Ligand binder design. Structure first.
Ligand code: O1M
Length: 171
């Protein structure tokens, strides 16, 4: 059976309990934690590409008021559907399965200023999603997995001082 498991799920859960936040900048910012997954049940002999995108979680924005995240207004029009291709792509099933697959170099931005960056709307909530694409497939089979533990609000600056502190503590 194809199985895609989140690595360091207990680290992500320490951020999610505070409500996780990721900085977006003009030039783009790497994530912490990094999204890493373990993969089993690919065909070791087949070639696959791994893609990452971010799904908008809500029909509204968020705001941090009196130490709580609350609904903050109507949303901005959806960010364009940016996809990040894992740099090891395309590669053998055996490659993807022999060690966790790390998205350590993806950058999150709030300006379409290119460079394979992912544009997000500040004060909107997003859920990472990985796609596995089989190479040379006339059916163009894709598999998609979501990672609820990794939901976060995109911000231009940390709102929750407990998140600022945790980002330093574990990084
Ligand atoms: N005390 C805990 O149980 N946490 C904190 C550390 N955390 C972790 C995992 C990988 C890593 F690189 C850094 C930190 C795992 C969950």
């Amino acid at each position: 059976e194809l199985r895609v498991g989140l690595e360091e799920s207990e680290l992500w859960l320490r951020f999610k309990e505070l409500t996780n936040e990721m900085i977006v900048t003009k030039n783009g910012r790497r994530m912490f934690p990094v999204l890493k997954v373990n993969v089993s049940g690919l065909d070791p002999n087949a070639m696959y590409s791994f893609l990452l995108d971010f799904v908008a979680a809500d029909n509204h924005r968020w705001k941090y008021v009196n130490g709580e995240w609350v609904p903050g207004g109507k949303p901005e029009p959806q960010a364009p559907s940016c996809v990040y291709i894992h740099p090891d792509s395309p590669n053998f099933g055996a490659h993807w399965m022999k060690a966790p697959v790390s998205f350590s170099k993806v950058k999150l931005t709030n300006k379409l200023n290119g460079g394979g960056q992912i544009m997000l709307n500040s004060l909107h909530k997003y859920e990472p999603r990985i796609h596995i694409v089989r190479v040379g497939d006339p059916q163009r089979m894709i598999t998609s997995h979501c990672f609820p533990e990794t939901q976060f609000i995109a911000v231009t600056a940390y709102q929750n001082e407990e998140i600022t502190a945790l980002k330093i503590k574990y990084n």
